[PDB]
Amino acid sequence: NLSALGIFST
Amino acid sequence: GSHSMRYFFTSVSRPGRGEPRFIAVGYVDDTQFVRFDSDAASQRMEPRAPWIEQEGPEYWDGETRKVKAHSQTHRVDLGTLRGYYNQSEAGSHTVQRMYGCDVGSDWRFLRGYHQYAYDGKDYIALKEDLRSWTAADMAAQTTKHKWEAAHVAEQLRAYLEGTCVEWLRRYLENGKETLQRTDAPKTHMTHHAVSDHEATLRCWALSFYPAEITLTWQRDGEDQTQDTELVETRPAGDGTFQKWAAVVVPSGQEQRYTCHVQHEGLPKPLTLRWEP
Protein backbone atom coordinates (compact mmCIF):
# COMPACT_ATOMS: atom_id res chain seq x y z
CA ASN A 1 0.00 0.00 0.00
CA LEU A 2 1.63 3.26 -1.26
CA SER A 3 1.70 6.28 1.10
CA ALA A 4 -0.65 9.23 0.14
CA LEU A 5 1.22 11.13 2.98
CA GLY A 6 4.71 12.71 2.96
CA ILE A 7 5.16 12.55 -0.91
CA PHE A 8 6.07 16.22 -1.61
CA SER A 9 7.88 17.58 -4.73
CA THR A 10 11.53 18.74 -4.74
CA GLY B 1 12.15 -13.50 12.02
CA SER B 2 12.19 -9.86 10.75
CA HIS B 3 10.08 -8.67 7.73
CA SER B 4 9.96 -5.57 5.44
CA MET B 5 7.69 -3.90 2.86
CA ARG B 6 9.65 -1.64 0.42
CA TYR B 7 8.56 0.50 -2.57
CA PHE B 8 11.08 1.44 -5.32
CA PHE B 9 10.43 4.31 -7.83
CA THR B 10 12.55 5.24 -10.92
CA SER B 11 11.96 8.25 -13.28
CA VAL B 12 14.15 8.85 -16.40
CA SER B 13 13.89 11.97 -18.63
CA ARG B 14 13.96 11.43 -22.45
CA PRO B 15 15.27 14.67 -24.05
CA GLY B 16 13.56 15.43 -27.42
CA ARG B 17 11.67 12.08 -27.06
CA GLY B 18 8.61 13.15 -24.92
CA GLU B 19 7.35 12.10 -21.43
CA PRO B 20 9.72 10.57 -18.85
CA ARG B 21 9.79 6.80 -18.13
CA PHE B 22 8.31 5.99 -14.68
CA ILE B 23 8.52 2.52 -13.02
CA ALA B 24 7.23 1.66 -9.49
CA VAL B 25 7.75 -1.73 -7.79
CA GLY B 26 6.55 -3.06 -4.40
CA TYR B 27 8.22 -5.89 -2.40
CA VAL B 28 7.38 -7.73 0.82
CA ASP B 29 10.84 -9.07 1.88
CA ASP B 30 12.40 -10.46 -1.39
CA THR B 31 8.99 -11.00 -3.16
CA GLN B 32 7.68 -8.53 -5.82
CA PHE B 33 3.85 -8.13 -5.41
CA VAL B 34 3.02 -4.90 -7.41
CA ARG B 35 4.31 -2.99 -10.49
CA PHE B 36 3.49 0.18 -12.52
CA ASP B 37 5.15 1.04 -15.90
CA SER B 38 4.34 4.28 -17.88
CA ASP B 39 5.35 2.38 -21.12
CA ALA B 40 2.77 -0.47 -20.51
CA ALA B 41 -0.73 -0.97 -22.06
CA SER B 42 -2.79 -0.82 -18.80
CA GLN B 43 -1.71 2.57 -17.26
CA ARG B 44 -2.79 0.82 -13.98
CA MET B 45 -1.04 -0.67 -10.92
CA GLU B 46 -0.74 -4.44 -11.69
CA PRO B 47 -0.43 -7.51 -9.38
CA ARG B 48 2.80 -9.64 -9.53
CA ALA B 49 2.05 -12.26 -6.78
CA PRO B 50 -0.86 -14.75 -6.34
CA TRP B 51 -1.91 -13.39 -2.88
CA ILE B 52 -2.47 -9.69 -3.94
CA GLU B 53 -4.81 -10.63 -6.91
CA GLN B 54 -7.64 -11.23 -4.33
CA GLU B 55 -7.85 -7.45 -3.41
CA GLY B 56 -11.05 -5.69 -4.59
CA PRO B 57 -11.36 -3.01 -7.35
CA GLU B 58 -11.10 -0.33 -4.55
CA TYR B 59 -7.47 -1.41 -3.80
CA TRP B 60 -6.39 -1.29 -7.51
CA ASP B 61 -8.23 2.06 -8.17
CA GLY B 62 -6.56 3.47 -4.98
CA GLU B 63 -3.04 2.18 -5.80
CA THR B 64 -3.43 3.40 -9.46
CA ARG B 65 -4.44 6.97 -8.43
CA LYS B 66 -1.52 7.06 -5.87
CA VAL B 67 1.24 5.66 -8.18
CA LYS B 68 0.13 8.22 -10.86
CA ALA B 69 0.40 10.97 -8.14
CA HIS B 70 3.99 9.69 -7.42
CA SER B 71 4.63 9.74 -11.25
CA GLN B 72 3.43 13.40 -11.42
CA THR B 73 5.69 14.48 -8.50
CA HIS B 74 8.75 12.79 -10.17
CA ARG B 75 7.86 14.47 -13.53
CA VAL B 76 7.99 17.89 -11.74
CA ASP B 77 11.18 16.83 -9.81
CA LEU B 78 13.07 16.15 -13.09
CA GLY B 79 12.37 19.74 -14.32
CA THR B 80 13.19 21.26 -10.89
CA LEU B 81 16.50 19.35 -10.45
CA ARG B 82 17.58 20.21 -14.09
CA GLY B 83 17.13 23.88 -12.94
CA TYR B 84 18.77 23.47 -9.47
CA TYR B 85 21.94 22.03 -11.12
CA ASN B 86 21.61 24.24 -14.33
CA GLN B 87 22.03 21.17 -16.63
CA SER B 88 21.20 21.26 -20.41
CA GLU B 89 17.90 19.84 -21.73
CA ALA B 90 20.06 17.62 -24.06
CA GLY B 91 21.00 15.04 -21.35
CA SER B 92 18.95 12.24 -19.70
CA HIS B 93 18.68 12.41 -15.85
CA THR B 94 17.41 9.88 -13.26
CA VAL B 95 15.34 10.29 -10.06
CA GLN B 96 15.02 7.32 -7.62
CA ARG B 97 12.89 7.01 -4.43
CA MET B 98 12.78 4.10 -1.90
CA TYR B 99 10.67 3.91 1.32
CA GLY B 100 9.31 1.23 3.66
CA CYS B 101 9.28 -0.24 7.19
CA ASP B 102 10.90 -3.24 8.98
CA VAL B 103 8.99 -5.33 11.60
CA GLY B 104 10.61 -7.77 14.11
CA SER B 105 9.34 -11.38 14.68
CA ASP B 106 6.43 -9.88 16.77
CA TRP B 107 5.36 -7.93 13.56
CA ARG B 108 5.75 -4.59 15.53
CA PHE B 109 7.60 -1.47 14.16
CA LEU B 110 11.51 -1.67 14.12
CA ARG B 111 12.69 1.09 11.64
CA GLY B 112 11.32 3.22 8.78
CA TYR B 113 13.32 4.80 5.90
CA HIS B 114 12.73 7.24 3.01
CA GLN B 115 15.65 7.85 0.62
CA TYR B 116 15.79 9.98 -2.61
CA ALA B 117 18.58 10.01 -5.24
CA TYR B 118 19.39 12.23 -8.29
CA ASP B 119 21.62 10.74 -11.04
CA GLY B 120 22.62 7.70 -8.91
CA LYS B 121 23.66 9.72 -5.82
CA ASP B 122 22.10 10.43 -2.39
CA TYR B 123 20.11 13.70 -2.66
CA ILE B 124 18.07 13.72 0.61
CA ALA B 125 17.42 10.91 3.20
CA LEU B 126 15.26 10.76 6.39
CA LYS B 127 17.42 9.95 9.52
CA GLU B 128 16.88 6.94 11.90
CA ASP B 129 14.81 9.21 14.31
CA LEU B 130 12.31 9.99 11.41
CA ARG B 131 12.24 13.73 12.46
CA SER B 132 15.31 15.21 10.58
CA TRP B 133 16.99 15.13 7.13
CA THR B 134 20.48 14.53 5.62
CA ALA B 135 20.93 16.76 2.48
CA ALA B 136 23.88 15.84 0.16
CA ASP B 137 24.64 19.37 -1.22
CA MET B 138 23.41 23.01 -1.43
CA ALA B 139 20.59 22.13 -3.92
CA ALA B 140 19.24 19.39 -1.55
CA GLN B 141 19.39 22.11 1.20
CA THR B 142 16.66 23.96 -0.86
CA THR B 143 14.52 20.76 -0.81
CA LYS B 144 15.31 20.20 2.93
CA HIS B 145 13.96 23.71 3.85
CA LYS B 146 10.81 23.16 1.66
CA TRP B 147 10.21 19.73 3.37
CA GLU B 148 10.75 21.19 6.92
CA ALA B 149 8.20 24.00 6.07
CA ALA B 150 5.64 21.33 4.92
CA HIS B 151 6.51 19.04 7.96
CA VAL B 152 7.17 16.13 5.50
CA ALA B 153 9.15 14.18 8.23
CA GLU B 154 6.05 14.06 10.53
CA GLN B 155 3.88 12.87 7.56
CA LEU B 156 6.28 9.98 6.62
CA ARG B 157 6.81 8.99 10.33
CA ALA B 158 2.95 8.52 10.51
CA TYR B 159 2.84 6.32 7.31
CA LEU B 160 5.98 4.30 8.35
CA GLU B 161 4.79 3.66 12.02
CA GLY B 162 1.05 3.28 11.00
CA THR B 163 -0.26 2.39 7.47
CA CYS B 164 3.11 0.80 6.35
CA VAL B 165 3.29 -1.93 9.12
CA GLU B 166 -0.54 -2.48 9.20
CA TRP B 167 -0.64 -3.39 5.45
CA LEU B 168 2.64 -5.41 5.82
CA ARG B 169 0.90 -7.63 8.49
CA ARG B 170 -2.18 -8.05 6.18
CA TYR B 171 0.10 -9.04 3.21
CA LEU B 172 1.99 -11.55 5.47
CA GLU B 173 -1.36 -13.15 6.60
CA ASN B 174 -2.92 -13.21 3.04
CA GLY B 175 0.39 -14.55 1.58
CA LYS B 176 1.14 -16.95 4.52
CA GLU B 177 2.03 -19.87 2.11
CA THR B 178 4.63 -17.72 0.15
CA LEU B 179 5.95 -14.92 2.47
CA GLN B 180 6.19 -16.82 5.85
CA ARG B 181 8.04 -19.84 4.28
CA THR B 182 11.82 -20.39 4.60
CA ASP B 183 13.44 -22.67 1.94
CA ALA B 184 16.74 -24.23 3.12
CA PRO B 185 19.55 -24.10 0.54
CA LYS B 186 20.06 -27.39 -1.33
CA THR B 187 23.89 -27.59 -1.37
CA HIS B 188 26.54 -29.51 -3.41
CA MET B 189 30.21 -29.03 -4.43
CA THR B 190 31.80 -29.26 -7.92
CA HIS B 191 35.46 -29.71 -8.92
CA HIS B 192 37.28 -28.51 -12.10
CA ALA B 193 40.92 -29.56 -12.77
CA VAL B 194 42.50 -26.22 -13.94
CA SER B 195 46.19 -27.33 -14.36
CA ASP B 196 48.57 -30.10 -13.17
CA HIS B 197 49.05 -27.71 -10.12
CA GLU B 198 45.51 -26.37 -9.29
CA ALA B 199 41.78 -27.18 -9.13
CA THR B 200 38.61 -25.09 -8.49
CA LEU B 201 36.14 -26.13 -5.77
CA ARG B 202 32.69 -24.52 -6.28
CA CYS B 203 30.26 -24.57 -3.32
CA TRP B 204 26.60 -24.21 -4.45
CA ALA B 205 23.47 -22.98 -2.59
CA LEU B 206 20.27 -23.45 -4.75
CA SER B 207 16.46 -22.93 -4.34
CA PHE B 208 16.78 -20.91 -1.04
CA TYR B 209 14.56 -18.09 0.44
CA PRO B 210 15.00 -15.48 1.66
CA ALA B 211 18.04 -14.07 -0.28
CA GLU B 212 20.27 -13.40 2.84
CA ILE B 213 23.02 -16.12 2.90
CA THR B 214 26.71 -16.53 3.94
CA LEU B 215 29.08 -18.90 2.04
CA THR B 216 32.62 -19.03 3.63
CA TRP B 217 35.63 -21.26 2.73
CA GLN B 218 38.02 -22.68 5.41
CA ARG B 219 41.47 -24.30 4.94
CA ASP B 220 42.24 -26.59 7.97
CA GLY B 221 39.53 -24.70 9.99
CA GLU B 222 41.11 -21.22 9.15
CA ASP B 223 38.88 -18.63 7.29
CA GLN B 224 40.09 -18.40 3.65
CA THR B 225 39.52 -15.14 1.64
CA GLN B 226 42.59 -15.59 -0.68
CA ASP B 227 42.09 -17.27 -4.15
CA THR B 228 38.21 -17.19 -3.56
CA GLU B 229 35.43 -15.92 -5.90
CA LEU B 230 31.94 -15.11 -4.48
CA VAL B 231 29.12 -14.24 -7.02
CA GLU B 232 26.20 -11.93 -6.03
CA THR B 233 23.01 -13.70 -4.86
CA ARG B 234 20.84 -14.12 -8.05
CA PRO B 235 17.13 -14.84 -8.69
CA ALA B 236 16.36 -18.38 -10.07
CA GLY B 237 13.10 -16.80 -11.34
CA ASP B 238 10.78 -19.15 -9.31
CA GLY B 239 10.83 -16.96 -6.13
CA THR B 240 14.10 -18.66 -4.94
CA PHE B 241 17.74 -17.51 -4.98
CA GLN B 242 21.13 -19.05 -5.94
CA LYS B 243 24.76 -18.32 -4.94
CA TRP B 244 28.15 -19.97 -5.23
CA ALA B 245 31.63 -19.50 -3.74
CA ALA B 246 34.79 -20.98 -5.34
CA VAL B 247 38.39 -21.45 -4.18
CA VAL B 248 41.44 -22.38 -6.31
CA VAL B 249 43.44 -25.09 -4.43
CA PRO B 250 46.75 -26.93 -4.91
CA SER B 251 46.54 -30.41 -6.59
CA GLY B 252 45.83 -33.03 -3.84
CA GLN B 253 44.71 -30.49 -1.12
CA GLU B 254 40.89 -30.55 -1.87
CA GLN B 255 40.07 -32.35 1.46
CA ARG B 256 41.78 -29.53 3.51
CA TYR B 257 38.98 -27.17 2.32
CA THR B 258 35.44 -26.92 3.81
CA CYS B 259 32.52 -24.77 2.63
CA HIS B 260 30.24 -23.29 5.41
CA VAL B 261 26.62 -22.23 4.59
CA GLN B 262 24.46 -20.09 6.96
CA HIS B 263 20.77 -19.42 6.20
CA GLU B 264 17.64 -18.55 8.28
CA GLY B 265 16.15 -21.95 7.16
CA LEU B 266 19.10 -24.11 8.37
CA PRO B 267 18.57 -25.30 11.97
CA LYS B 268 22.42 -25.68 11.99
CA PRO B 269 25.21 -24.29 9.75
CA LEU B 270 26.26 -26.84 7.04
CA THR B 271 29.85 -27.98 6.44
CA LEU B 272 30.57 -29.40 2.97
CA ARG B 273 33.71 -31.21 1.81
CA TRP B 274 34.66 -32.47 -1.68
CA GLU B 275 33.70 -36.19 -1.99
CA PRO B 276 34.67 -37.74 -5.40
Partner: protein
Protein backbone atom coordinates in the same frame (compact mmCIF):
# COMPACT_ATOMS: atom_id res chain seq x y z
CA UNK C 1 26.60 11.86 -12.90
CA UNK C 2 27.41 8.34 -11.55
CA UNK C 3 28.06 5.63 -14.20
CA UNK C 4 28.30 1.97 -12.98
CA UNK C 5 29.07 -0.82 -15.49
CA UNK C 6 26.73 -3.86 -15.32
CA UNK C 7 27.73 -7.19 -13.73
CA UNK C 8 26.35 -10.04 -15.89
CA UNK C 9 25.43 -13.63 -14.85
CA UNK C 10 23.97 -16.19 -17.32
CA UNK C 11 22.56 -19.38 -15.70
CA UNK C 12 19.62 -21.83 -15.72
CA UNK C 13 16.75 -21.88 -13.17
CA UNK C 14 17.34 -25.66 -12.52
CA UNK C 15 20.48 -27.80 -12.95
CA UNK C 16 20.84 -28.30 -16.74
CA UNK C 17 19.76 -31.74 -18.01
CA UNK C 18 20.09 -32.29 -21.78
CA UNK C 19 16.62 -32.73 -23.38
CA UNK C 20 14.82 -31.39 -20.25
CA UNK C 21 12.80 -28.13 -20.36
CA UNK C 22 14.30 -25.31 -18.21
CA UNK C 23 14.73 -21.49 -18.05
CA UNK C 24 17.78 -19.54 -19.25
CA UNK C 25 18.44 -16.44 -17.13
CA UNK C 26 20.59 -13.38 -17.72
CA UNK C 27 20.89 -11.34 -14.51
CA UNK C 28 22.28 -7.81 -14.99
CA UNK C 29 23.02 -5.78 -11.85
CA UNK C 30 25.06 -2.90 -10.34
CA UNK C 31 24.48 -0.59 -13.38
CA UNK C 32 23.69 3.14 -13.76
CA UNK C 33 22.06 4.77 -15.58
CA UNK C 34 19.01 2.54 -16.34
CA UNK C 35 19.11 2.47 -20.18
CA UNK C 36 20.40 -1.06 -20.95
CA UNK C 37 20.11 -3.49 -23.91
CA UNK C 38 19.90 -7.24 -23.06
CA UNK C 39 19.41 -10.10 -25.59
CA UNK C 40 19.66 -13.88 -25.02
CA UNK C 41 21.52 -15.63 -27.88
CA UNK C 42 21.14 -19.19 -29.24
CA UNK C 43 24.10 -20.13 -31.51
CA UNK C 44 24.91 -16.37 -31.75
CA UNK C 45 21.27 -15.55 -32.83
CA UNK C 46 18.74 -13.41 -30.85
CA UNK C 47 15.88 -15.22 -29.01
CA UNK C 48 12.53 -13.40 -29.47
CA UNK C 49 10.39 -14.99 -26.73
CA UNK C 50 12.28 -13.33 -23.79
CA UNK C 51 10.66 -11.85 -20.65
CA UNK C 52 12.17 -9.45 -18.06
CA UNK C 53 11.54 -8.46 -14.43
CA UNK C 54 10.48 -4.85 -13.60
CA UNK C 55 13.47 -2.48 -13.14
CA UNK C 56 14.47 -2.19 -9.44
CA UNK C 57 17.62 -1.07 -7.54
CA UNK C 58 19.93 -2.02 -4.64
CA UNK C 59 21.02 -0.13 -1.47
CA UNK C 60 23.74 1.73 -3.53
CA UNK C 61 20.98 2.89 -6.03
CA UNK C 62 22.46 0.70 -8.85
CA UNK C 63 19.81 -1.07 -11.05
CA UNK C 64 19.13 -4.80 -11.64
CA UNK C 65 17.03 -6.79 -14.19
CA UNK C 66 16.42 -10.51 -14.91
CA UNK C 67 15.91 -11.53 -18.58
CA UNK C 68 14.61 -15.12 -18.99
CA UNK C 69 13.36 -17.51 -21.68
CA UNK C 70 12.13 -21.15 -21.80
CA UNK C 71 14.80 -23.41 -23.36
CA UNK C 72 15.86 -27.11 -23.47
CA UNK C 73 19.66 -27.38 -23.11
CA UNK C 74 21.44 -29.88 -25.42
CA UNK C 75 25.15 -30.94 -25.57
CA UNK C 76 25.80 -28.86 -28.79
CA UNK C 77 23.81 -25.55 -28.42
CA UNK C 78 25.70 -22.39 -27.18
CA UNK C 79 23.66 -19.86 -25.16
CA UNK C 80 24.86 -16.37 -24.27
CA UNK C 81 23.72 -12.95 -23.03
CA UNK C 82 24.60 -9.77 -25.03
CA UNK C 83 24.54 -6.55 -22.91
CA UNK C 84 24.93 -2.94 -24.13
CA UNK C 85 25.24 0.11 -21.83
CA UNK C 86 26.75 3.65 -22.09
CA UNK C 87 29.72 2.43 -19.89
CA UNK C 88 30.79 -0.22 -22.51
CA UNK C 89 32.94 0.80 -25.53
CA UNK C 90 31.15 -2.19 -27.16
CA UNK C 91 28.60 -4.87 -26.24
CA UNK C 92 29.64 -7.61 -23.75
CA UNK C 93 28.75 -11.24 -24.67
CA UNK C 94 28.77 -13.68 -21.67
CA UNK C 95 28.48 -17.42 -22.64
CA UNK C 96 26.34 -19.75 -20.46
CA UNK C 97 28.48 -22.10 -18.31
CA UNK C 98 26.48 -25.12 -16.89
CA UNK C 99 28.51 -24.95 -13.63
CA UNK C 100 28.35 -21.12 -13.03
Amino acid sequence: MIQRTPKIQVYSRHPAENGKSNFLNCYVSGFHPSDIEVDLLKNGERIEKVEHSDLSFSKDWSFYLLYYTEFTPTEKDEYACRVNHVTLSQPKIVKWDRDM
